[PDB]
Amino acid sequence: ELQLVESGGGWVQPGGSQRLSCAASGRIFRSFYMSWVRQAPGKGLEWVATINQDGSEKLYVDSVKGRFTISRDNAKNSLFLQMNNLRVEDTAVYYCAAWSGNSGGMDVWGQGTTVSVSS
Amino acid sequence: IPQSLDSWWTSLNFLGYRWMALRRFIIFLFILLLALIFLLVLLDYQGMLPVCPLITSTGPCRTCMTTAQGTSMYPSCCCTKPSDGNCTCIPIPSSWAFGKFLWEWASA
Amino acid sequence: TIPQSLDSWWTSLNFLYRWMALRRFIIFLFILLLALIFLLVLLDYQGMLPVCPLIPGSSTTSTGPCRTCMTMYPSCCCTKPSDGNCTCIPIPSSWAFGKFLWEWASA
Amino acid sequence: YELTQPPSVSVSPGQTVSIPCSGDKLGNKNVCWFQHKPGQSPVLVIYEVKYRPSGIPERFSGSNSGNTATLTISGTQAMDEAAYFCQTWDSTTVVFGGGTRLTVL
């Protein structure tokens, strides 16, 4: 099916910016919705962002509205989430999920890139 | 291609040019019809012919995905709610949807 | 009766026993295929051939999932990941197969 | 949207666990269940309340009755031990549950 590999995670000071990249392998990436879901350290899953096929509809959770920008490009088959001005509570592991049409939910998931905002 | 079919037919019979061209054109029309029906069969084989099988019980409705771009989403389930049926939703198969609809239609 | 007339017409075009039987049989097969094609066209016109049109993106989305079946004609649709509700479009009664193929060819 | 799960439920191998997911009006909504294992990506276990993706063992099943949902696991194998999150849609934002830790004794 789809091989999703995230990247772009590392130590950053508070208020910095990161660009997490999910490099989906396969043309079928173009058809599905994608989403970024963060599991905070020692906490449960938390939804971050959702993107449709073309990018007309971009949905964020109330905690990150106005700070994160989800986007995708279909020529390179990649899903980029740009987080700006991170807060100390945004530390998490961000997962790239795909809403496959043969599943009915976030069935295809990526490794999970460990963001770490700290002093 | 039409020449081979014409030769085959005249051989079956016995194993001016305008009407020969007319016979060739009718042969080409038949070949085109066969090609069209074969194309329909192939597209159904590949399962992008969303013929939902009806004519009971419920089923899953999956996520919406767009086929070959176009902002239009390929349907995943077929839903009906009469005024007193409680409504049912049956998924469209990835197998021969048209063929299955024809079969479970011709059964009754 | 029809196959003999058909091969006689073909002979007339040509000329300005087992072979005859085989020719009649292949003509019978071809005319049966054409008859089934016409039957499919008739069924499509009458409306008894549900083919799903591709769901428009501009769909307003329902107030609940498909299983609630909230706004019903035999529509077909899929659950939208945006809000968990599903965007449904009725099957066109008049020419479902034809309209779906026209949409497919338009892209 | 307050969506609640027990902190953890544990059983011996063999019994059947009914993980609850209590949320208001949850009967109207459809619920998905994800299985997250420490160090592995989440796995979609149930979608549309009662339906399993291809490859998910038939042990898993889902249920919904009023303002609550349930994930039923039968014949708990030694691998099943994981965290289980129930997810729904408030209006347009997906809310996940707290997540219950199933441990195989």
Author numbering:
A (entry chain H): 1 to 119
B (entry chain B): 28 to 42, 71 to 110, 116 to 168
C (entry chain A): 27 to 42, 72 to 126, 133 to 168
D (entry chain L): 2 to 106
Relevant lines from the article:
Hepatitis B surface antigen (HBsAg), the sole membrane protein on the HBV viral envelope, plays crucial roles in viral attachment to host cells and serves as the target for neutralizing antibodies (NAbs). S-HBsAg is a transmembrane protein with a cytosolic loop (CYL) and an extracellular hydrophilic antigenic loop (AGL) or the “a”-determinant, which contains the B cell epitope recognized by the host adaptive humoral immunity. HBsAg dimer is the basic building block of the viral envelope. Cryo-electron microscopy (Cryo-EM) structures of HBsAg dimers in complex with NAb Fab fragments reveal that the antigenic loop (AGL) of these distinct HBsAg types share a common structural core comprised of four β-strands.
To understand the structures of two types of HBsAg and how they are recognized by different groups of antibodies, we determined the structure of HBsAgType A in complex with FabHBC and HBsAgType B in complex with Fab H006 at resolutions of 3.25 Å and 3.13 Å respectively. In the map of HBsAgType A in complex with FabHBC, we could resolve the density of a portion of the H1, H2, AGL, and H3 regions of HBsAg, but not other regions, suggesting that they have considerable flexibility in detergent micelles. The structure of HBsAgType A shows that the anti-parallel β1 and β2 strands of two HBsAg subunits pack together to form a central four-strand β-sheet core of AGL. To our surprise, although the 16 cysteines in the AGLType A form six intramolecular disulfide bonds and two intermolecular disulfide bonds, the cysteine pairs that form these disulfide bonds are completely different between the two HBsAg subunits in HBsAgType A. For example, C107 pairs with C137 in subunit A, while C107 pairs with C138 in subunit B. The asymmetric disulfide bonds confer structural asymmetry to the AGLType A. Close inspection reveals that the symmetry breakage occurs in the AGL, starting around C107 where the first disulfide bond is formed, and ending around C149 where the last disulfide bond is formed. The structure of HBsAgType A in complex with FabHBC shows that FabHBC binds to one side of AGL through an extended interface. Both the heavy chain and the light chain of FabHBC contribute to the binding to a structural epitope on the surface of AGL, which is shaped by the H2-β1 loop and the β1-β2 loop on subunit A and the H2-β1 loop on subunit B. Particularly, the H2-β1 loop of subunit B is recognized by CDRH1 and CDRH3 of FabHBC and the H2-β1 loop of subunit A is bound by CDRL1 of FabHBC. The β1-β2 loop on subunit A binds to CDRH2 and CDRL3 of FabHBC.
